[PDB]
Design a protein around this motif. Structure first.
Motif, short mmCIF file in Angstrom:
data_model
loop_
_atom_site.label_atom_id
_atom_site.label_comp_id
_atom_site.label_asym_id
_atom_site.label_seq_id
_atom_site.Cartn_x
_atom_site.Cartn_y
_atom_site.Cartn_z
N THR A 1 4.46 2.49 1.93
CA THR A 1 5.29 1.21 2.38
C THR A 1 6.77 1.21 2.21
O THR A 1 7.35 0.29 2.49
N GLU B 1 0.99 -1.08 -0.05
CA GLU B 1 0.06 -0.11 -0.10
C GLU B 1 0.92 1.13 -0.16
O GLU B 1 1.97 1.22 -0.22
N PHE B 2 0.44 2.45 0.26
CA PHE B 2 0.93 3.74 0.35
C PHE B 2 1.96 3.64 1.26
O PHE B 2 1.88 2.96 2.25
N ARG C 1 17.03 12.55 -1.83
CA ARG C 1 17.04 11.06 -1.23
C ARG C 1 18.28 10.19 -1.72
O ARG C 1 18.96 9.63 -0.66
N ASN D 1 15.10 5.45 7.09
CA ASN D 1 15.77 6.73 8.19
C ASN D 1 16.07 7.70 6.89
O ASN D 1 15.49 7.65 5.81
N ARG E 1 9.35 -1.17 8.63
CA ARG E 1 8.24 -1.79 7.90
C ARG E 1 8.77 -3.14 7.70
O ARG E 1 9.85 -3.45 7.93
N1 LIG Z 1 13.82 11.80 4.64
C1 LIG Z 1 13.07 10.83 5.20
N2 LIG Z 1 13.12 10.28 6.64
C2 LIG Z 1 12.47 9.50 6.67
N3 LIG Z 1 11.28 8.87 6.42
C3 LIG Z 1 11.37 9.44 5.21
C4 LIG Z 1 12.03 10.26 4.55
N4 LIG Z 1 11.51 10.69 3.20
C5 LIG Z 1 10.44 9.94 3.12
N5 LIG Z 1 10.11 9.04 4.10
C6 LIG Z 1 9.41 8.29 4.40
O1 LIG Z 1 9.21 7.22 3.64
C7 LIG Z 1 7.99 6.40 3.46
C8 LIG Z 1 7.76 5.80 2.39
O2 LIG Z 1 7.40 6.62 1.17
P1 LIG Z 1 7.51 6.04 -0.49
O3 LIG Z 1 7.74 7.09 -1.24
O4 LIG Z 1 8.56 4.95 -0.56
O5 LIG Z 1 6.24 5.39 -0.49
P2 LIG Z 1 5.59 4.22 -1.61
O6 LIG Z 1 5.32 3.12 -1.26
O7 LIG Z 1 6.19 4.62 -2.83
O8 LIG Z 1 4.14 4.95 -1.70
P3 LIG Z 1 2.89 5.32 -2.83
O9 LIG Z 1 2.04 4.22 -3.19
O10 LIG Z 1 2.09 6.48 -2.41
O11 LIG Z 1 3.80 5.62 -3.96
C9 LIG Z 1 7.10 7.44 3.85
O12 LIG Z 1 6.06 7.15 4.85
C10 LIG Z 1 7.58 8.96 4.26
O13 LIG Z 1 7.15 9.31 5.58
#
Ligand SMILES: Nc1ncnc2c1ncn2[C@@H]1O[C@H](COP(=O)(O)OP(=O)(O)OP(=O)(O)O)[C@@H](O)[C@H]1O
Ligand SMILES: Nc1ncnc2c1ncn2[C@@H]1O[C@H](COP(=O)(O)OP(=O)(O)OP(=O)(O)O)[C@@H](O)[C@H]1O
Ligand SMILES: Nc1ncnc2c1ncn2[C@@H]1O[C@H](COP(=O)(O)OP(=O)(O)OP(=O)(O)O)[C@@H](O)[C@H]1O
Ligand SMILES: Nc1ncnc2c1ncn2[C@@H]1O[C@H](COP(=O)(O)OP(=O)(O)OP(=O)(O)O)[C@@H](O)[C@H]1O
Ligand SMILES: [Ca+2]
Ligand SMILES: [Ca+2]
Ligand SMILES: [Ca+2]
Ligand SMILES: [Ca+2]
Ligand SMILES: [Ca+2]
Ligand SMILES: [Ca+2]
Ligand SMILES: [Ca+2]
Ligand SMILES: [Ca+2]
Ligand SMILES: [Ca+2]
Ligand SMILES: [Ca+2]
Ligand SMILES: [Ca+2]
Ligand SMILES: [Ca+2]
Lengths: 311, 311, 311, 311, 311, 311
Positions: free
Chosen positions: F111, F108-109, F150, F302, F282
């Motif tokens: 994740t 899901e989102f 990132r 992190n 996670r």
């Molecule tokens: N600099 C950071 N430090 C810590 N956590 C971070 C940082 N940048 C992003 N995150 C966390 O990374 C998590 C995962 O985000 P990610 O972009 O990987 O999601 P996703 O699985 O691609 O979701 P979606 O389906 O919405 O695209 C988010 O909950 C966000 O809070």
DNA sequence: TGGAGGTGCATCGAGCTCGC
DNA sequence: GCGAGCTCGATGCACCTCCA
């Protein structure tokens, strides 16, 4: 051109004998010079004594000896070639239909044999400089497919008055092979008074296919046809007209050759094989000629006679 | 029109010889003038001496010489053209079915060949100003598919009394190819007493497909068919009727051509190729003609004969 | 109806020659009048001299000349039309299956071709006023799918005694195409002694699909099939029976046309195209007819033969 | 049943010619009577003169003429019907699988086609009073899915000795379509010496799906398949066996029809459409039959062959 | 087992022709005996005259006629059944995977299709008394999911030397459907020199799902797939190997059926439907078989290949 | 690694044809060896004659036959495994993300799918001994969620210069599914000049969820997606890169499965299911793999990319 | 001493999930 | 605690006498 037979009465022949010649079909001194002894003996009031006298007198009026190929090459440069209405056929025939010879056009149905004969019946009346023969046309039809409306369409294309074009086309309908030959004797009479440039027999073999049926009559058929083609050659040498005959085809079951056998194949100087192309376009091929290479050309049947395809 | 053969007895022929001619199929002076020497020698009580006498006498009653294309163009302006019931086919044929010639209609099954022949069998009885021929009709059927109920439907469309329309249609059923030809000799007798405008042979080739089977009989088949088509042409010139024959198709396995070969292709002056369209509508195409351009037209088979499509 | 061939011995033919005709398949004077010269020369003890004598004598016993469409319209009003068991098909066929012609029924499998033939084999025995032909039935089966149990079910529907219905159905099983044709010569013999009203060939083309295989045998296949369909037409004119043949379909890969080609398409006077509807209901369409408009009708195959759908 | 071909040597045929017939696949007088002239000319030491002599002699040994529907109804009352092991299918088929005809069973995978063929291969050996045919079985397998262990399970259900059941099942594995047909010639030889009651081809079309691939080979595929189905019909008429073939399905992408096209649809007398129900239960539907109404019935594939569902 | 193709050179075939057979994919006399005439004509230096000579010679080396079900039941008692590593699957399959047939395993992802194929690739090398086939394994992978590390884990479970287990597994990676088929021709060559017991195609349909896309290519897809499954059946009959193919699923949107259509459903003798249970346990169900009842069994994917669940 | 397509011009292929291959997307000899005949016929200046010549030449440059599992086990020992930045995920994946295969990460989102892809985009540039792939990274983003900030944080963790890390990450933004596939053809061109170690498609299915909407477009959606996943597998075999795609989830309403259906489930070699734990931690679970047991591992997101949780 | 075209046949192949 | 439709392509087959 040809000398009237009346010149024999001046040269020492009784006018009663000349009358007997004219009722046998001889209307010109050339026609007598070209005939053998046999054809004169068959006439009633002509004996062998009168035959040699008649032939000897006609022999000094018509040159019937040897000559140089140089002199003959000059006379053949003055031969007329009648345009076929198609710029492509005239290049294939290197000028058009040649006078003084027998040209045969054969092909299956709707291949354009009757349409070329209708175009020629008009273009033979054009001035020499326009590709014509500057003479009348004579059309011996054996099928009933002669359409003066097609002549009027060709006449409009060349800017000729359709009323005068029809007046210079003698038409006869032959109903059997005997009538077809009997029509040629009247043709010789008409070629003396007025100048003709073209003689069309369409078709020259259609009536032979049914007046003589089966192998049992094959010999008599080919004999009668051979005599017909001889009097055609005679009309070509006597009057210098272009003889254009039309022939039919038969399937080889053993892929279509012309009918008439070896008689018409040898006799025809030039043979044109017409076959269908796409739409209104058709292909003519030199099937036999003394001077023309075997080649093909594409023409078309338009609303104004035989012409060139649009593409 | 044609002159009865009895006019020869006035011109110097014994009535016993005229009787011998009538039993051979000659009921008109034209029929004798159009025949060769051979067809008269085959009759029993006729020798070569009587043949030339018979032909010479018939030759001065029928004009059988040359004429101008102008004169022939006037006679062809008076030729009758019979309406086909369809306004579209009449524009394609530029008037309708032409008398004095042989028109061939071919196509696969249900293409409308028998329906056009039924419409023509009624429209040939209309006055000239309505597109008819003002004469009787003769229908030689070789399949058993002649339906007077279709004639009554066409007769109702043109406001004619159906009882009189059926009285002016002579009907014969041919069962073999010999009977098909023997029926034409009786046709010549009937065309002398009363005036006919149309002769239908439906179909002209169906019985040839089975009376003569295989390549071994192909030659005799085409010979017999060719003789049949000659007597048809004779009936067209003798009586000026419109001859409309029907032909069948065969698949090319190598996309459907008419049967009969080159014999029927050359003999037919006009050939109409009928093919199926949508529903009751069908398409006719000029497949061969001396004067008609290759074009198509769409007609329909309605409850009242051949007509024009609704759209 | 037809006159026995024995009437020729009274009219001047030797009984030994009549015997030779009967061994060739001629059991009626009509069968001889309808035959050409060729079919009589092929018999051993028959020369050309005896042929014309035989044909001339048979020609004055059978009317084989011209007649008025009025007279022919009266004879066609007396033609019998056999009910198909379905009130809807009888309106489509405007009465039912017509005698004296060849009716073709084609369609894919289970479309009801064998079931209509079984219903007709019973309804042809009904009195005329009930829609029958008041005669026997003859069933030439080429597949082995003839089921007398289906006849008994149709017989119960019309209140006929099933034992007598089966006694009036002649049955033959053909195993090849040669046997299929040889069975028709025996059919002519049986139609002379007792009156028949219907002849069924089910199926008329199934054995041709495998006795002749490939394009290399396509010509001989269609020739043999064409001869078969000619003797069927002969049986229809000779005895006035209704000939109902069954045909098979083939897919167009390029949506299903009947097999047999143009031979069976031209020969069949009426063609019925059967296709499947819902459940037991099926749709018949006029695919070809001289007098019937192209229309459709829905029938059903019930436990008592062909009938009308419940809705 | 059928008469051995050796009876022809008594009736006036040289034993050397009979030997030549047996090497062509003719082991019975019926097989020769049922063959056309063509199939005998193709044999080397057989000319047309010997052909008619051979056929004429075989024609008086086998009745090949007309007969009454009453007589044919008596012979069809003696036809054997082989039980399918299911009481429900026997009511649907009104007795069981019918001998002397070709029954087609088609359906998607696992629908029970090979299981019905295994049950039939045992039940065809039961006495007549138990629903069998009292004869051997012959199983032509084209997939490799023949399992004698299934026969032993069906044999235990009917109390037969499994060792004797397997001895009365002739088995052959076909590897291509040519081998599949070549196996039928050996089948005719084996049906002469011992009595068979059933012939299974499972599956009759599986190898055609890949020996011939694409539309380019579609015609040759259907020709070869049609010849195969003709020799099957021949084996059914010659020996009165029940022919049960198995067919495969194909999806309609435009909901599943059997493969083989119109060839196998017309040829099959009875067609059974098998579809899956719940669990081990399956539904058979009459898809085509001359005498059976379109209905359905539910059967089951148990541990002892095809039977009835528990509920 | 199978006889080398070199035995044909002794029996009267030129070694140059045998060389031409080997380049077409025929390395065994059985492979030639099992081929039709067509597959031999397609080879260049092979004419129809050499074809019958080649087939006739190969026909007397391989028994290709009828035999008793008793004899066939003895040969099927000697068929090898390869253990699947699970005691529960072996009871469901009544012994294990059967040689000489095509077994299809299908299911959604992670259902164990690639894991069963890895267990079989090792257990096929066990002695017969341990449940193996005592032969090599050949693994045609079309996905890249072949993991020799899984083979080493199964090899440790059965106490085999992992180095020798990997040496007896021939591996090929197919990249398209053409390569997938071309790999089978090399498989036939390798099965001649050394003995193989198992052939794995994992997956047999994965590349067909994308080399052919859409309904427009559906026909060509199924044709190519059908040819592939025929050469698999050929490898099973020629060499008696067990062919285990893997198939993929598709959702029914209208609850998941295998892809490949009716082609792979009919061709597969046995079909196993694998579905996921709890954790590492999974359920196999007999989806199609000639001899196996529809039942289920539960197995597990452990760290040492396919085995039985802990509970 | 892969051989440039220019090696075909040396081996006998015209450089004009090689140019035509490069405009179709073939930049390597392997890419041509791996393609079927169909994909080469679709190119304009390539006929079937040139196709076999092209494929035959490419076939001897690339080994495309059988080999031992021993040899394949040596090549798989040299496969690179890219560290995921987390010590726990590397134990779960037994080394890290595997090159030459397609790894799918879904959840899901939030994740962590985009965060793992960012960590991999840097760790793929580490030396081999540090857990990297020693190559560039290519990131195809379909959402706009690519954040170079990132990458700089992950680069600081491993002591790499952030300026050089960003220079070795090729980035493309896809806006529709057609653009997403068109981007892969440019990817093949870039993988030839410089060495890449990782290809990221994030997300591979997001645009399919809206470019194709509803069940009516479901088939075309899955077809297009299947072609996309085939060219990904092609890039993995051609260049030995690690393909890491990201997938989205959907709720089961009848508890969340990945979208894409069975197409992406079968195609993905390894599938990782990411779910949220506590805070920044996670859980990743092996959802599908050929060689990895189903297990879970806990990682954390992190400030310096993906790593291990504090506890 | 050449003359005459004829005649249609054969069906095949399934694929693709989605949405709190 | 439930409802949602759309998708096409393909090809090759030979044989047949008689005529005064
Ligand atoms: N600099 C950071 N430090 C810590 N956590 C971070 C940082 N940048 C992003 N995150 C966390 O990374 C998590 C995962 O985000 P990610 O972009 O990987 O999601 P996703 O699985 O691609 O979701 P979606 O389906 O919405 O695209 C988010 O909950 C966000 O809070
Ligand atoms: N006005 C016109 N416009 C165009 N084409 C025409 C016209 N009149 C006739 N044609 C075409 O001329 C073609 C040739 O017909 P033609 O009379 O020359 O045939 P043919 O060779 O004599 O045939 P046959 O052997 O039947 O006598 C026909 O196909 C016809 O359609
Ligand atoms: N001993 C048995 N007990 C119960 N059911 C069985 C037994 N043996 C086989 N079956 C079942 O019989 C069913 C029908 O299989 P069968 O061989 O008849 O299929 P088919 O119609 O020939 O299929 P295909 O097209 O694949 O050849 C299978 O579903 C199988 O599970
Ligand atoms: N060493 C192992 N120990 C336990 N389970 C394992 C091991 N290796 C793989 N598995 C499991 O085996 C299962 C089946 O994987 P397999 O490769 O057989 O799938 P499949 O049916 O071929 O799927 P697909 O259609 O994706 O190719 C996976 O769920 C995986 O977790
Ligand atoms: Ca003409
Ligand atoms: Ca008609
Ligand atoms: Ca004509
Ligand atoms: Ca039937
Ligand atoms: Ca008809
Ligand atoms: Ca089966
Ligand atoms: Ca049937
Ligand atoms: Ca797998
Ligand atoms: Ca199967
Ligand atoms: Ca988001
Ligand atoms: Ca994201
Ligand atoms: Ca997978």
């Amino acid at each position: 051109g040809p000398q009237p037979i009346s010149r024999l009465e001046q040269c020492g022949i009784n006018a009663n004998d000349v009358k007997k010649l004219e009722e046998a079909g001889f209307h010109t001194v050339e026609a007598v010079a070209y005939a053998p002894k046999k054809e004169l003996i068959n006439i009633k009031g002509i004996s062998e004594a009168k035959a040699d006298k008649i032939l000897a007198e006609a022999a000094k009026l018509v040159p019937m000896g040897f000559t140089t190929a140089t002199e003959f090459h000059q006379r053949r440069s003055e031969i007329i070639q009648i345009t076929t209405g198609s710029k492509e056929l005239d290049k294939l025939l290197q000028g058009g239909i040649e006078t003084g010879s027998i040209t045969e056009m054969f092909g299956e149905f709707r291949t354009g044999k009757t349409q070329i004969c209708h175009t020629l019946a008009v273009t033979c009346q054009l001035p020499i400089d326009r590709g014509g023969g500057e003479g009348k046309a004579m059309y011996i039809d054996t099928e009933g497919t002669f359409r003066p409306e097609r002549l009027l369409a060709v006449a409009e294309r060349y800017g000729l008055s359709g009323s005068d074009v029809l007046d210079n086309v003698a038409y006869a309908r032959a109903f059997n092979t005997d009538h077809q030959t009997q029509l040629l004797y009247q043709a010789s009479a008409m070629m003396v008074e007025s100048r003709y440039a073209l003689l069309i027999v369409d078709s020259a073999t259609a009536l032979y296919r049914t007046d003589y049926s089966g192998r049992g009559e094959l010999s008599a058929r080919q004999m009668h046809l051979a005599r017909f083609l001889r009097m055609l050659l005679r009309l070509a040498d006597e009057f210098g007209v272009a003889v254009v005959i039309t022939n039919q085809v038969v399937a080889q079951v053993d892929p279509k050759k012309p009918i008439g056998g070896n008689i018409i194949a040898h006799a025809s100087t030039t043979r044109l094989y017409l076959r269908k192309g796409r739409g209104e376009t058709r292909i003519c091929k030199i099937y036999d000629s003394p001077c023309l290479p075997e080649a093909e050309a594409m023409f078309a049947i338009n609303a104004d006679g035989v012409g060139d395809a649009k593409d």
